[PDB]
Design a protein around this motif. Structure first.
Motif, PDB file in Angstrom:
ATOM      1  N   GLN B   5      43.234  57.467  36.379  1.00 51.57           N
ATOM      2  CA  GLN B   5      42.485  56.507  37.179  1.00 51.57           C
ATOM      3  C   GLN B   5      41.470  57.172  38.106  1.00 51.57           C
ATOM      4  N   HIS B  31      37.153  56.476  34.246  1.00 52.19           N
ATOM      5  CA  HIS B  31      38.412  56.014  33.670  1.00 52.19           C
ATOM      6  C   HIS B  31      39.103  55.019  34.599  1.00 52.19           C
ATOM      7  N   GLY B  32      39.737  54.001  34.024  1.00 53.00           N
ATOM      8  CA  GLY B  32      40.487  53.046  34.826  1.00 53.00           C
ATOM      9  C   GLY B  32      39.679  51.855  35.297  1.00 53.00           C
ATOM     10  N   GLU B  41      40.936  54.114  25.899  1.00 52.62           N
ATOM     11  CA  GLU B  41      41.357  54.540  27.233  1.00 52.62           C
ATOM     12  C   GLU B  41      42.842  54.859  27.284  1.00 52.62           C
ATOM     13  N   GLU B  45      44.531  58.545  28.351  1.00 60.50           N
ATOM     14  CA  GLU B  45      45.323  58.673  29.573  1.00 60.50           C
ATOM     15  C   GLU B  45      46.231  59.899  29.516  1.00 60.50           C
TER      16      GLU B  45
END
Ligand SMILES: [Cl-]
Lengths: 8, 153
Positions: B5, B31-32, B41, B45
Motif C-alpha cells: 500500500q 499501489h493500493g 495488483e 502484493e
C-alpha cells in the motif's frame, strides 16, 4: 438506449 | 523494499491473451489505489525488488465478463462522414465518453460492442519488479504515480 451519432 | 500500500512500483511486463502479445513495456504505478486491474495488483502484493513472476488473471479479476447485451446493431449513418467504419475501429458515444468497437458491417447496419475490448478474456502476465519506493505527498494527493514517460506499447 440508442444514440444519435458516434464520434471518432 | 516490498510492494505494498502507497508504494510506487516500477514493473516491466508482457501481457498475452491466448498466446498473443497485446501489450508490453515498463510502467510505474501507485499501489493500493485501484490503478491496475485487481488481479494484477493482488499478484504484485508483497513482491520484492528484483523479483520475476508469472500471473494468470481470470476475466473476473481483470476487465470483467463479456456482456452479450453490449453487442448491438446501429445505423451506419450514425458514424462520422470521414470515418473508416471497419471491424476493429473504435468510436465513442456520450453518456463521459462510452467507447465502442465496430465488430461487423453489413450494408447500412453496423454491429458494435460496448464491452471493454478485453472483457471475458483471461490475461497472462510475465512481470519483473524493478523498483519500489515510497509515494510522495503529491502522488498520494493525485491518487497516482508521477509521470515517468510512455514506456509501454
Ligand atoms: Cl498510478
Amino acid at each position: 438506449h440508442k444514440y444519435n451519432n458516434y464520434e471518432g | 523494499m516490498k510492494v505494498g500500500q502507497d508504494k510506487v512500483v516500477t514493473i516491466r511486463y508482457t501481457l498475452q491473451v491466448e498466446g498473443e502479445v497485446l501489450d508490453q513495456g515498463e510502467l510505474s504505478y501507485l499501489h493500493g489505489h485501484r490503478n491496475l486491474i485487481p488481479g494484477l495488483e493482488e499478484a504484485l502484493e508483497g513482491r520484492e525488488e528484483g523479483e520475476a513472476f508469472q500471473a494468470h488473471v481470470p476475466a473476473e479479476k481483470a476487465y470483467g465478463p463479456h456482456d452479450p447485451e453490449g453487442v448491438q446493431v446501429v445505423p451506419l449513418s450514425a458514424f462520422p462522414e470521414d470515418a473508416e467504419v471497419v471491424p476493429g475501429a473504435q468510436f465513442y458515444a456520450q453518456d463521459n465518453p462510452m467507447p465502442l468497437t465496430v465488430v461487423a458491417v453489413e450494408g447500412e447496419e453496423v454491429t458494435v460492442d460496448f464491452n471493454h475490448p478485453l472483457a471475458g478474456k483471461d490475461l497472462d502476465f510475465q512481470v519483473e519488479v524493478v523498483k519500489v519506493r515510497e509515494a510522495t505527498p503529491e502522488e498520494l494527493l493525485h491518487g497516482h504515480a508521477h509521470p515517468s514517460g510512455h514506456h509501454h506499447h
